[PDB]
Amino acid sequence: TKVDEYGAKDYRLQMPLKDDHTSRPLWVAPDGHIFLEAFSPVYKYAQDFLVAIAEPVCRPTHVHEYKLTAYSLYAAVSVGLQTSDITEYLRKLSKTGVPDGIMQFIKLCTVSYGKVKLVLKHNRYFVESCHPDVIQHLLQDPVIRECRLRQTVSFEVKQEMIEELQKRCIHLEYPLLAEYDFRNDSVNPDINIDLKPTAVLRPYQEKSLRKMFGNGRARSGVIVLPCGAGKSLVGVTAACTVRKRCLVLGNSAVSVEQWKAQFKMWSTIDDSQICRFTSDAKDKPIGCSVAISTYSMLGHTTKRSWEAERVMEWLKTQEWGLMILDEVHTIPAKMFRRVLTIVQAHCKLGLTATLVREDDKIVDLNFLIGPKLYEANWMELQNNGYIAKVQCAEVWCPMSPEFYREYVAIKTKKRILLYTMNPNKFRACQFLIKFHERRNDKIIVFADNVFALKEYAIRLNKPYIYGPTSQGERMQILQNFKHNPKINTIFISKVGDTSFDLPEANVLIQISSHGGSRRQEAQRLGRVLRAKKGMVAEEYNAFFYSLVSQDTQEMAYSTKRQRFLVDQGYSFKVITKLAGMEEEDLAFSTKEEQQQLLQKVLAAT
């Protein structure tokens, strides 16, 4: 609240300093921000505690940055950490005390939890509460009465209005409890699903699962883990532990196929007990319990087949022990979020690898599913070797003079097709691909503009893939990329980042970018995180290049796009010039070639 002569807020008169400050490695700002030391001997203990009570926002190598909020404190109380159980240790760890504001915030957040519990039974959602005064003073607003369908006091609530009531309670200071007591539940018989000994659970996976299962009752929340880290394995383990009917929701056909494959590989459950509620292929969804479908499958708003109506009505009628939702970052979308209310589930676990978006709808996920349970430390995984180390880089390509002339001259938005296609970046990517090709490194080129992708691919006579590409040709190209030594590069369009199971690649070049999309950046980066059989963290075998054009809007998009990665800790090194480019022969070495490309770009319209 107090501002120094500079931008920073002043806290000299706010909180004191502990005498044994050097012993205490923890800081506590009044706003809730906490700065932990990664060099302290008790760093691991501090990390566990701060991860339990707070969500990371920046975890560089030296000083980690956490911030706590109501949802994080609720998650701590869910794993059973009382207000004293957290605040006492926070004061002990803190080297400068705990401001009264944070003290009262912690007390209020912890006490305002568990008073209101939401439990669904016999397809009816009852708002139970041991304390009656909470309901007595909670029925002030008319929205509660109109929402409601027309000790331990409970009342049934309308299915459709659950989301609205949930978001209302969040700001009403009475969060709802979505814990599932699968251990004590006889209404829905347990499913015959077991985890085979073959599956191996990594320490971070076990920690995330423990945080989800803080007690005997499973907690509904979001666990953010890298795509290469085995989030599919974690989800399968969660379903197996729940031992009740599970409905996994993908985002595309490849996602549903991979989820079925993961279920069979890691769970002893029989093949016949798994169904694919997909229009292209139906495996008798009503016959068995464990189901895999997608958000468009359930939330579809327009006409439905008669068979799909029967399946949908069966799904609505039945109650699900677990509702796994992969790629939760798309949930707050209108149609996708309608699925949450369409289907009934005790705990709706959420898995993803890039929980970031521009529109401030990510906060809605906290109430749509639950608080962010776990968020794996990418740097720690890199050190442990679970994830391949990446030498993140941004190759700056100077724009050609004529291209810049038209780019600046026109105030329209042909620049997206212009600066994405310039001779300098073309030569840069050509040289980079040549260097890695002679180095036997697998290349996965990326480009949002299909026009630029096709032009680059034809000029380099490479197998470019994109949306309307036939499925058979897609599979043939991927198989050749994985097996044929003669080919070691594939030029994938935006479809690549959506969802796929692609072979591990040693480099990932990105000539163009869709825009300032942290989601797309992280999604594409996750491709090369696939750990090799015997690599090492320090070898930096994996590389990521995000080619950008200097003095262009692409620079703004790149800088705005690398925020999530730098927050994780990756250091994007800038490369002004590439050694050996002048000696190596490359296309567009003469003005005429650039002129023809420019004429084609102008004629693109």
Binding site: Y45, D48, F49, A52, G80, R183, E206, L209, N215
Partner: peptide, 18 residues
Amino acid sequence: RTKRWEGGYERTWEILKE
């Protein structure tokens, strides 16, 4: 037959005392 996760949170910091 329950799993280790159902037991409870590890509470890794509880070991340290001052």
